[PDB]
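Quick start: load a record and inspect it. Here is regulatory protein E2:
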Amino acid sequence: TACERLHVAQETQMQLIEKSSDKLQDHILYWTAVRTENTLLYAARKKGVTVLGHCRVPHSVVCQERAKQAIEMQLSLQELSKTEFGDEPWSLLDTSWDRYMSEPKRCFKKGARVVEVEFDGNASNTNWYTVYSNLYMRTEDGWQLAKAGADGTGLYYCTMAGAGRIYYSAFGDEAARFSTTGHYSVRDQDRVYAGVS
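Running the structure step on this input writes:
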């Protein structure tokens, strides 16, 4: 029945990806199925299983990690749905591990845009950063909405626990890698910033 439970858990993921729902509950469901699959697979690995039915069992370290990630997503999302934010539309990508682990780390993110940094007054000396306008992060006071942006210093988010911009990236650290002079200019949307290191 570990073989049938595996089939259902894999089929659930495949059904929900096709559907591509904008409801949080479908994504809770998707991650709980990812959890189930990798838990069973990990349990199979401990017992020395290498093929369960018609699919190969990944290395135990791999199954263990995929299950742990899915536990974290499941529980996090379940908490989210119990907040004011649960009502909002959530896609597969909004609730994906890479989005969650993108900077800043361990928060869900919607509203992507590209920030462009030019390094030595040199149009060919350039780099780009994906910034999310809407960030949902757990405080000791549940989940809360934060906004992210860029200025001359770096990429930052602001909250009302300690009023001010809180930087998760510093452009001076970027210019220390990609510039020869230390100066750079930052284009976020309709604003251009200057900076130095």
